[PDB]
A paper describes a structure:
The acyl-[name] synthetase (termed [name]) of the zoonotic pathogen [name] recycles exogenous fatty acid (eFA), bypassing the requirement of type II fatty acid synthesis ([name] II), a druggable pathway. Very recently, the [name] (533 aa) of [name] was found to feature a large domain at N-terminus (termed [name]_N) that is connected with a compact C-terminal domain by a flexible linker. As expected, a hexamer ring-like overall structure was invariantly formed in all the three types of [name] particles, regardless of a cofactor/inhibitor.
Unlike the two controls that are characterized with a dimension of ‘140x150x80 Å’, the inhibitor-bound [name] architecture is relatively compact, because that its dimension is only confined to ‘130x140x65 Å’. Presumably, the [name] monomer adopts an ‘open’ conformation to accept the sequential entry of various substrates ranging from decanoic acid, ATP, to holo-[name]. In brief, the pitcher-like [name]_N domain consists of three β-sheets flanked by α-helices, and provides a centrally-localized cavity for substrate entry. Whereas, the small cap-like [name]_C domain contains one two-stranded and one three-stranded β-sheets surrounded by three α-helices, hovering on top of the [name]_N active sites.
Author numbering:
A (entry chain C), B (entry chain B), C (entry chain A): 4 to 533
The structure:
């Protein structure tokens, strides 16, 4: 590759070696395990580059990583792409067969795997080909990664190449029969970091990330590049703390002792942290957790707001950067009380810089943003995956009509706020309208003797797909289906026949199938019940 | 596509419409079901082309087929490639998960499936994407294929395109963790037909296929294009009989009544046909079955020769055309008695026209053809798959050193005869030599109280991989491991320590794992026992 | 040239070193002169390659050959093309001026010429340029070719190149004012060999070439690559005998002593062999001569059939491979008596594999194959010359309408049999119909006092071109033109005015002009008489 120095390429090496702020004394902390300055971080990155070069990794090669959140993952986030190789992030929460399929599909050359992830490999070891070396990662000095790093020198001349070379890749289950692989380039990652920093960094007084913060992820970090946060924090040169195993008590201790101010987690982890007895006497009025997993509930937002936590939501769908929208509060919205606060903070949010985000039905129409007309979200951003890896027809459906299809049905307010109502496949197509099953699930969950509710659709000649409810009862709770029918019929304000209460067809089931991540298997319930 | 008429392209349409001999009165017979002349066959091919065009199949599309041997499969062998689409042959003997993986990998658009293969689809129906239409095939008039054909006209202008467009594809399990997809072009198929017709058609008086024969396959016909035989017979314009379900009594009745003279099957089916009571009073002295499945045994060849059957072996490995070598007997070899006949007819054979077939060790050396020096077979033929579909590193190992690697270890006689001794992965690497486990399996199977034997290797510091035997005993047979050790030690004439009898390590196991095809799972036994 | 080993090229070296059968003990025999095994043949081919390399012959060079049928011509058929050079076959039966024109047009670099062809060169020696070396060939040890071969080693690495490189070329007089040069590639020759072997090798019991035959050409072998037979026999590894001078007694002795079973000759040579006194006590019931020169007569076929000779006809026109059609007899046609045998064996035949062979008038229409509608034969085959060398407008007329024009007018039966009736230029265009002069020549030759007859056309205002007969009388035979007119008028069953007997215009001429090959100079008779 030959490049004229006038022509500038957006590379991750520019993100690391030309940050907004660089403090050599700033420290990266791995929880109760290790602590080293930014200068040591740069030296270790160069050592890792030398070690990867020594093992035969080249520009076209792929390196797979399988561990928790640590300094090693942060070093892999940089060193591998800067060599030019591909960083394959493996979802350790998938089934061993799916993990093996992803490894075979991506054709990884070297695998770095944590010690306590070894049994998962042990049952798919012989099935794996195309892999030459396994590096075992440990939390003590007997780590193979540490022994590999301590042999190399801290001197590397990082090459310059085209900004469109692929840097990272990972696989998402989605709704297809096999996991789909998404990929991004150096330019896309750099632009995502810059745009999100411009969006959330310029807010007046709420939900802003600045150079005085202390960062600590609470998301798995093999999903969606941990929302791009580790790239951003390194760009700001802020203190970074990595917890590892995600134990609520260790997390609370790290927040108290390291003075963490910025984080991102999911509603389940936030609820566990808030309900922990250790947290009842902990100061929380400096913390700005970002909830992005799925559908931050209003009650959880209220409970966090009563603890003086700047909690706000964001949207990302694992092939869109991921960040597309974040709730931002104008100064006259900060003076509202906790109910109006929790109303706004639980929304999907306004689109971030350089995002279009139209609402569109089938045949691509541009339904207005009145605030109640729902439709599928289609976006155009500088950091979208062009297609699926080694796929043709799903790639065509992904970019149908010239826009990326999110698969989420939402309505957009006149002021720009987005409120996601359901998923495209989960919409019940009664007659000629489209009701969202989420509000029926919420209504049925309001019952005192109901634990979990799943709503699906079953064919019906005159009224299309009609709804069906599977409910799980509580301890020593036995309410007949007629009682639940009356409970749902009690509510008002909905369309269709009367209030669409003649076809609820609620049934009581002991258990509801869930994915390996922990999400209801609506497809399967469809297979089981129809 | 624009072509100068002077420039000639080798296409399957030339194979069908410009045969060696064309008799409109010659008939194709589907067993006790249907019987129609060659003119009707051409009309049905044109009707199928029109029907496929009507459903939206185009040049780049793929059509999958799942049924037994019938006129419909013969029509699919032609019509789909002549449109320019890809014919994906699905192995119905694989597990449903493997079948689903192959369907997802090949991205089939339309699936033609037999009725009694429906349950297999029923458990993978929802997992399947990228498929638009399913056509159910039946043996009566309610077949969807027949109803689709009877609407179209018998008039089609078949296009002309580049001879390098892919025509057929199918998947082989091999030794990898996932099935590997191989593909061939129109030119390769035409050249394979022409070369094999030139090779076996020009023999003096034994094992020759000519225009007066009657053809009937006994191989699954989704493997290896049924050895290319259906293409060849259609080229010769000979009578063709398709049995379907492969029931030994129906097969014998078809051979008796249709006067079948040429066939290809596997040793198991041949043994079942020979041992059937119905066959004890059947005339067999016009039949020229070709055995190509795997390792035709000498005893079976003798038993068939005592029934006046011209039985001979052929070699094909599912990515080599498949035909690479066929045994051909010189006129002074026909005067030998049954023992010398069965010696020669059970060999791998001499290479067919336009085949190189060298013997080669690691680092690619060209060990001489002395008759006892074993090595891996590497070939160069006009009908080899260039690589594996959507694969990189296995493709590199397939064509390592500039030759296609068969994976079979054999020795070549000075006269050109090849004798396959084992598989590359199944070789036991004791010390510095390579013993073949097949002869030890044969020796141990010679015991009176032994049913089946599997030989594997287990590590040993001073002598590399050493052999281990897993044996299954007969009804009320109990012989200790020491007795089998002495039985193996009784024989002579082998190298290594004494006769390599200090490490046999024979063990008795109730059952031995087998593939879905019925072959021992040596990899698994390795996983289970070590 | 760089080639990926996966990409296979069809080369003559593959035809020689990868045959159907290779027997090192099989011998090539030059009549009463030399006899050497196939291993010696391969060694001599390598030696000739080394010798040609030593003289400066390169890929683009051309080597001309001028001799009879011998081992040297067979070695030139292989060695020259395998180097990549062009083999120019010179017709030694042409006039010295035509030979000189062909040499100048083809620009030969080295000329190999037999001793007794030296006088022909002596009168055109000074006129020749662009030629650097002359190699004199002799039948004794003083041959320059033998002395050149005995210096080189038997070791050559034959290169691999594109399959579309030109291999052979030769010149045909045709109907143009100067000889026209045709050329073929390696791929075309290999495909011709494979296709004809597939066509004639797969016949049931008549007219088949197999690996147990003994081959001996009786055609000049500088015409039409000797019908491709020497390439085919070498591919089958059969014994080959080369007679040389074509003396009938030497030919009969070779057939008797070498046990020749397959041959190809012309009707004149066959008649000379059958009428020889030596042949009256010779066994002929193993011989399968192929007649392909021109228009095998029915009487000669009957006479050969009474001698128990499997005599059959073939069609080739010197720019079509040459083989296009061969008569093949179905098993129920072998049971007919000698008259019906001679009827079928004298026909042009059915088209061989991969040949289209439509019948077409001017403006390219596709007149039906009823069996009596005549038209010009146009073909599409994998082994047709794209054009004439260094020619433009004749090349356009050769491939007019997208098909190669044979120049022969024939009718095709409903069963596929072709019967050539005349040449396009020799058709008499009376009024609005086209009569063939061949049947009038046959009718007039039936007279008892007639030796030879030539029919031409002369203008006539109201009836287009009308026929004219030039006849030669026998010894002391004097029949007036009126007697011949009445003799022709006696016959019946023809169209046009009455029986087209009012314009015969028969004339008696002492001699009729003939080409240097021995064919009537109809153009010249047109020039002389009109």
């Amino acid at each position: 590759y030959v490049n004229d120095p006038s022509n500038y390429q957006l590379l991750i090496k520019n993100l690391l070696f030309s940050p907004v702020a660089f403090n050599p004394e700033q420290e990266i902390v791995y929880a109760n395990h290790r602590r080293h300055s930014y200068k040591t971080f740069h030296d270790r990155v160069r050592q890792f580059a030398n070690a990867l070069t020594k093992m035969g990794v080249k520009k076209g090669d792929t390196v797979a990583v399988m561990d928790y959140d640590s300094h090693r993952y942060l070093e892999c986030y940089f060193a591998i792409p800067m060599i030019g190789a591909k960083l394959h992030m493996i979802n350790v929460r998938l089934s061993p067969e799916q993990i093996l399929y992803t490894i075979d599909h991506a054709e990884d050359d070297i695998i770095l795997i944590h010690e306590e992830f070894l049994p998962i490999l042990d049952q798919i070891k012989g099935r794996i080909d195309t892999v030459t070396r396994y590096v075992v990662l440990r939390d003590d000095e007997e780590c193979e990664y540490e022994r590999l790093l301590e042999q190399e020198s801290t001197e590397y001349n990082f090459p310059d190449f085209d900004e469109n070379t692929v840097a990272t890749t990972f696989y998402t289950t989605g709704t297809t029969g096999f996991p789909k692989g998404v990929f991004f380039t150096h330019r896309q990652l750099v632009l995502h970091t810059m745009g999100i920093l411009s969006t959330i960094g310029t807010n007046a007084s709420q939900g802003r990330l600045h150079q005085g913060d202390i960062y600590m992820p609470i998301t798995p970090m093999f999903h969606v590049h941990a929302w791009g946060l580790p790239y951003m924090a390194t760009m700001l040169g802020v203190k970074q703390v990595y917890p590892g195993k995600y134990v609520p008590d260790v997390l609370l201790n790290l927040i108290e002792q390291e003075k963490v101010t910025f984080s991102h987690c999911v509603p389940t982890i936030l609820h566990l942290l808030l309900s922990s007895p250790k947290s009842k006497a902990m100061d929380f009025s400096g913390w700005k957790v970002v909830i992005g997993g799925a559908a931050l509930p209003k009650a959880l937002c209220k409970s966090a707001l009563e603890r003086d936590i700047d909690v706000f939501a964001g949207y990302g769908m694992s092939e869109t950067g991921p960040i597309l929208s974040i709730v931002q509060l104008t100064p006259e919205q900060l003076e509202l009380d906790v109910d109006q606060q929790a109303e706004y903070r639980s929304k999907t949010g306004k689109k971030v810089a350089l995002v279009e985000a139209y609402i569109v039905d089938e045949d691509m129409n541009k339904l207005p943003h009145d605030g109640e007309t729902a439709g599928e979200i289609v976006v155009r951003a500088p950091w979208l995956t062009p297609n699926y890896y080694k796929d043709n027809k799903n790639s065509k459906a992904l970019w149908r009509g010239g826009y990326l299809h999110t698969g989420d049905v939402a309505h957009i307010d006149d002021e720009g706020f987005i409120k996601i109502t359901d998923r495209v496949k989960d919409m019940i197509k009664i007659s000629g309208e489209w009701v969202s099953s989420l509000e029926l699930e919420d209504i049925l969950h309001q019952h005192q003797s109901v634990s979990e509710v799943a709503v699906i659709g079953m064919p019906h000649n005159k009224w299309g797909e009609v709804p069906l409810a599977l409910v799980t009862l509580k301890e020593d709770a036995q309410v007949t289906e007629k009682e639940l029918l009356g409970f749902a019929k009690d509510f008002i304000n909905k369309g269709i026949l009367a209030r669409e209460a003649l076809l609820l067809k609620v049934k009581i089931v002991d258990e509801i199938a869930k994915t390996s991540v922990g999400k209801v298997d609506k497809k399967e319930l469809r297979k089981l019940h129809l």
